[PDB]
Amino acid sequence: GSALFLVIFAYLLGSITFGEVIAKLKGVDLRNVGSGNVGATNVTRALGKKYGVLVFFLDFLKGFIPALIAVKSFGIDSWVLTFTGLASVLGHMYPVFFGFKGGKGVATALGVVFAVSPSVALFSFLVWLGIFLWKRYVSLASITATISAFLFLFVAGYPVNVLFMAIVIGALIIYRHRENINRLLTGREHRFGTLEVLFQ
């Protein structure tokens, strides 16, 4: 009852593609910029860091806020958390309000994980930092951090409902990165920071 409302709410909230909304407000088409994706990284390319960080936090809250409610109302070990977390990410990836063409789910999924375990969220972000500072590819860092998030939850002893949530979310995130992976493998993935050292 209240739980089915929470899952539907999570999917519909997730289905608000904030990057596209703010881009439209600014008169920019995100599909014509950079990677053509609609999440915070390509928002930064199209609109600047201010708007990318804003979209990061909105996409994060899409996952954090419903999952937090599931955690406090039903428990981390409830399949209501599993379905609320999945609904958030599935709405972000396949938004009912935007032709089912969404983002890749990194920020939203981090929000879900933060609601379950701030420590696991921190560790996964630490993995992300290392991989990003090393190779300067957002995609490579997100893929590695996504795999690590699942290992962290597995090794820390979280229950099956959480591991089910994490392996489906994780597999979906990696699959949504398949074009980045093809670019990585062929050497035309966008890389950060090479020319900026001439201005430092």
- Site for ligand 78M, rule CB under 6 A: 3-4, 7, 9, 11, 39-41, 44, 49, 52-53, 56, 65, 68-69, 72-74, 80, 83, 86-87, 90, 94, 100, 106-107, 109-110, 113-114, 118, 121-122, 124-125, 128-129, 135, 138, 140, 142-147, 149-150, 166-172, 174-175, 178, 181-182, 184-185
d(CA 46, CA 40): 10
d(CA 6, CA 165): 16
d(CA 53, CA 40): 7
d(CA 179, CA 130): 22
* Shortest distance in whole angstroms from residue 139 CB to ligand 78M: 8
Taking phi over 0 as left and psi of -120 to 50 as alpha, with beta for the rest, 36 belongs to left
* Shortest distance in whole angstroms from residue 27 CB to ligand 78M: 20
* Shortest distance in whole angstroms from residue 159 CB to ligand 78M: 15
Q: How far from the centroid of its chain's Cα atoms is residue 179's Cα?
A: 16
* Shortest distance in whole angstroms from residue 29 CB to ligand 78M: 18
